[PDB]
Amino acid sequence: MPPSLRKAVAAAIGGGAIAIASVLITGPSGNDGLEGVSYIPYKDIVGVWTVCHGHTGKDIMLGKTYTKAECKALLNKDLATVARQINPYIKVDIPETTRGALYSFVYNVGAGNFRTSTLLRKINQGDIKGACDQLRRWTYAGGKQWKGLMTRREIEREVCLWGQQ
Amino acid sequence: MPPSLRKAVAAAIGGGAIAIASVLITGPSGNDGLEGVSYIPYKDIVGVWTVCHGHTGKDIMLGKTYTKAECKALLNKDLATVARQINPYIKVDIPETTRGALYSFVYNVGAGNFRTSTLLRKINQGDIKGACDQLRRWTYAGGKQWKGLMTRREIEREVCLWGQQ
Secondary structure: OOHHHHHHHHHOHHHHHHHHHHHHHHOOOOOOOOOOOEEEEEEOOOOOEEEEOOEOOOOOOOOOOOOHHHHHHHHHHHHHHHHHHHHHHOOOOOOHHHHHHHHHHHHHHOHHHHHOOHHHHHHHOOOHHHHHHHHHHOOEEOOEEOHHHHHHHHHHHHHHOOOOO | OOHHHHHHHHHHHHHOHHHHHHHHHHOOOOOOOOOOOOOOOEEOOOOOEEEOOOEOOOOOOOOOOOOHHHHHHHHHHHHHHHHHHHHHHOOOOOOHHHHHHHHHHHHHHOHHHHHOOHHHHHHHOOOHHHHHHHHHHOOEEOOEEOHHHHHHHHHHHHHHOOOOO
């Protein structure tokens, strides 16, 4: 991963999985992460309304220009939600890096997908290294493989396996 | 602080930042820490129901008597929440003493207040001395400086500055 991002994830470690994920999504500067940011609402490719760091919901004011602080508040809430949605399903102790990287993964890919993934089953069997490797299989959308996903998956993989080496 | 407590801090240091904060809140006995303990809902001065060592939610039963057991459940959860809400905002590496000190402070003053604060800004510019000193600015409410908050911030501060001697 870029060295600034690496250092960023390093300092977030004391802050636990949530903070780790927040670095992955927003990046060191808070605007150069694996997710885009947008201060004004827009419809995505599936026609869902979205703003800030990829935030969707029934609470988007279409006429509003959002601040950096609003965007960060909303991410916090959404990450807490991801945690709520997936942590029940992780039946084993994993390191904070691994947890944070799965948050970032699930943020992108959705809770359903994760619940039925092979990645989870390898987590629940204690195969951490094997779970982190499953990430590379998640680069396909519209029967095309995406350079942007393959990169994201590589970076989430590094962090997922951060403790090992 | 009181020696009764200065020791009991050090007692759960190896428990990490959560355990440091949780200590400051309950103190060794359970009432003799920074928060007020109460096993029946009372309406506080601003008219919010409150129970145990400061727990407020919508999850409160108005005639119920809570146990020493159920209040530990509420606190731990509440403190999980504080860590979720503030850590992503903390971009640098910090001692578990310092972090735990901040968990307590935010318990008291709220995530919003914290996210906009000068203190967090000093934290993130690496200035930990400068950070902890900012605790002292948080001793007013309703016009007046309170001696009780003046104490409470000196305590939180002491713990905040445990690394630097």
